[PDB]
Design a protein around this ligand. Sequence first.
Ligand SMILES: CCN1/C(=C/C/C=C\C=C2/N(CCCCC(=O)NCCCOCCOCCOCCCNC(=O)[C@H](CCC(=O)O)NC(=O)[C@H](CCC(=O)O)NC(=O)[C@H](Cc3cc(-c4ccc(-c5cccc(Cl)c5)cc4)no3)CP(=O)(O)c3ccc(Br)cc3)c3ccc4c(S(=O)(=O)O)cc(S(=O)(=O)O)cc4c3C2(C)C)C(C)(C)c2c1ccc1c(S(=O)(=O)O)cc(S(=O)(=O)O)cc21
Ligand SMILES: [Ca+2]
Ligand SMILES: [Ca+2]
Ligand SMILES: [Ca+2]
Ligand SMILES: [Zn+2]
Ligand SMILES: [Zn+2]
Length: 159
Amino acid sequence: MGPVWRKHYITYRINNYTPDMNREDVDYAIRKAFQVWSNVTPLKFSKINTGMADILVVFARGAHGDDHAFDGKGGILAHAFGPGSGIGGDAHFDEDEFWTTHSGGTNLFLTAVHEIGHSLGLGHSSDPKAVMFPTYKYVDINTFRLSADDIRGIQSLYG
Ligand SMILES: CCN1/C(=C/C/C=C\C=C2/N(CCCCC(=O)NCCCOCCOCCOCCCNC(=O)[C@H](CCC(=O)O)NC(=O)[C@H](CCC(=O)O)NC(=O)[C@H](Cc3cc(-c4ccc(-c5cccc(Cl)c5)cc4)no3)CP(=O)(O)c3ccc(Br)cc3)c3ccc4c(S(=O)(=O)O)cc(S(=O)(=O)O)cc4c3C2(C)C)C(C)(C)c2c1ccc1c(S(=O)(=O)O)cc(S(=O)(=O)O)cc21
Ligand SMILES: [Ca+2]
Ligand SMILES: [Ca+2]
Ligand SMILES: [Ca+2]
Ligand SMILES: [Zn+2]
Ligand SMILES: [Zn+2]
């Protein structure tokens, strides 16, 4: 196994909000993202408004404090760090993208599910149906199901 959280109670905090979407939409998209993984694991995710949280959600552009700079609109949409203290577990989203709640631009919910998967310690899949497939794909939020590979992967880490 790579790094895994050694606790089932995992907190998260949204450090800043993208101006592309309204604030509640970002809150909703992120909350549903964690719930996707919560549905198939013994993991419980709780939101923190102020203070220390395991998983920090950040919207930034270009070079932004870590050794992994973003590249403007297109290309890399986001990245996340594996489980661990400090920057570990944190998920950063490229602000040069246009985040949406739909098919247009880049869907935040889908990207968040993928990144949180990284935050939980998952690698990539070669299954085009898997959410941990390396490249983005849009699918209606309610024709959406976790692939068997995603579920097998995450259950091998927790439970
Ligand atoms: C309407 C519709 N429809 C339909 C539908 C259906 C649906 C569904 C189904 C299903 N499912 C679900 C899921 C899956 C599905 C599928 O498959 N789908 C497919 C689709 C396809 O489409 C096509 C098109 O495409 C497009 C795409 O585009 C996009 C692009 C982009 N990309 C890129 O490239 C980017 C950029 C962009 C710009 O430029 O801007 N980039 C990227 O991405 C990067 C890369 C770069 C490089 O590398 O260089 N990357 C990044 O960014 C990263 C981050 C991220 C990621 C992400 C993501 C990922 C992934 C994803 C996904 C995928 C897939 C899926 C999903 Cl859900 C998700 C997402 C996202 N984000 O972000 C970076 P990173 O990684 O972080 C990194 C960083 C740094 C470093 Br140093 C490292 C790293 C399903 C499922 C499942 C299943 C199964 S299982 O077992 O598996 O569970 C099974 C089955 S079976 O059958 O076999 O049993 C199944 C399944 C499933 C199904 C299939 C069911 C239909 C219904 C079909 C229809 C429709 C419509 C219509 C119709 C008709 S009509 O006539 O009307 O027309 C008809 C019909 S019939 O048939 O009835 O006839 C139908 C229909
Ligand atoms: Ca980019
Ligand atoms: Ca962290
Ligand atoms: Ca933006
Ligand atoms: Zn970053
Ligand atoms: Zn990935």
